C-alpha cells in the first residue's frame, strides 16, 4: 500500500490559533494505526497522537488531536492553541497490523507559528 500523504507542506498560523494538517491514507483494510509525529532537534521522531489511540497511554496531551473525516481516508491532525515553540517539522505514519505489519511515513511538513 502507498504511504500516507501529509498536507500542507507549509502551514503558517498565529500563536493562540489552531493549526490543522491533513494525513490522507487509502486503507485497503480496517487493520491500520495512524500516527502523528514531530521531529525533535536530534532528528528523533516524537509521537503526538494516534488513531486508534494507544489504550496503554490514557491521559494524553489534549493540545494534539486527530479527527477522522467521513470519507475514511482523510484525518485532521490539529494543534490546539499553537505556541511559538510548536514551530518545527511534522509528519504522519501508517502502521499496518494484519495480515502483514509494516510502517510507512509521509513526507515531512513544516509548521510555522507566528507572533
Amino acid at each position, epitope marked *: 500500500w502507498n504511504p500516507p500523504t501529509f498536507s500542507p507542506a507549509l502551514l503558517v498560523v498565529t500563536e493562540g490559533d489552531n493549526a490543522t494538517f491533513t494525513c490522507s491514507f487509502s486503507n485497503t483494510s480496517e487493520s491500520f494505526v495512524l500516527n502523528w509525529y514531530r521531529m525533535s532537534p536530534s532528528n528523533q521522531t516524537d509521537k503526538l497522537a494516534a488513531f486508534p489511540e494507544d489504550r*496503554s497511554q490514557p491521559g494524553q496531551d489534549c493540545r494534539f488531536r486527530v479527527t477522522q473525516l467521513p470519507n475514511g481516508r482523510d484525518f485532521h491532525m490539529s494543534v490546539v492553541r499553537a505556541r511559538r515553540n510548536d514551530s518545527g517539522t511534522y509528519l504522519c505514519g501508517a502502521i499496518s497490523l*494484519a495480515p502483514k505489519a509494516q510502517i510507512k511515513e509521509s513526507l515531512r511538513a513544516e509548521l510555522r507559528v507566528t507572533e
Partner: antibody
Amino acid sequence: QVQLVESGGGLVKPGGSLRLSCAASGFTFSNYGMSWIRQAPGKGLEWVSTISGGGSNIYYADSVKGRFTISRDNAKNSLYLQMNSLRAEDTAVYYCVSYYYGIDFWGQGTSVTVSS
Amino acid sequence: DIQMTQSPSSLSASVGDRVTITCKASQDVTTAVAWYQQKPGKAPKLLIYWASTRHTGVPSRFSGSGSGTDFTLTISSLQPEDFATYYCQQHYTIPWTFGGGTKLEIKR
C-alpha cells in the same frame, strides 16, 4: 481500566462443540482487533484466530480452520469462538485478547477439556 | 508460517544479574517482534513490541533489540519478581507465531 472476561469453557467429548464468549470494557470496542490465544497444559502459547475491529478481516490457524469460527458483536462489546468438531489436542486455556502492536491486553482465560 | 526458536530453554540466575535471552525467526520478520512474561496460573503480559519498544508500565530494566531474524530480550539487573517464563512472538505476518519459551529460574 481495559477489561476482558471470558466464559463458556468446560468439558466436551471428542467431536463435540462449545461456544466461548468474551465481554470487553474500557475502550471503544469497534476500534480494536481481537484475538483468541490458547495454551495447552504444560505447553506454550498458540495463536488461534484474529478478527479486525469492524469484523471484515478474519484469520485462523491451520490447526482449527474449518472447525472454529470467530465473530464479534460490537453493539454488545462481545467476542465469540464457536468451536466445532473438537479434538483432544484442543484441550487448553483459551484467552480472549486484544492487540495493537503485539497483544497488549489479555483476559485470564477459560479452560476447555476435550476427553471421552 | 514463520517459526520462532527461543534459547536457552531455561536459565538459572541470581538477583542482580544481567540476563539476555534469544529468539530466532525462520525468515525475515523486520522488527515486528514482541516479548511477554508469564507466571504460573496467570495470563502473559506484554513487555516489548516492534523489537525494541518498551510497553507502558514495564520496568526500565527490560529492553529488547534485534532485526531480521535475530532478537534478544535483556533484563539489566534481575529482581525477585522477574523469575518467570518469557515468550517471544512475531507480529509480522499472519499466522502469528510464538517461541517455545525460556524459563528464568533461581540459581543455588
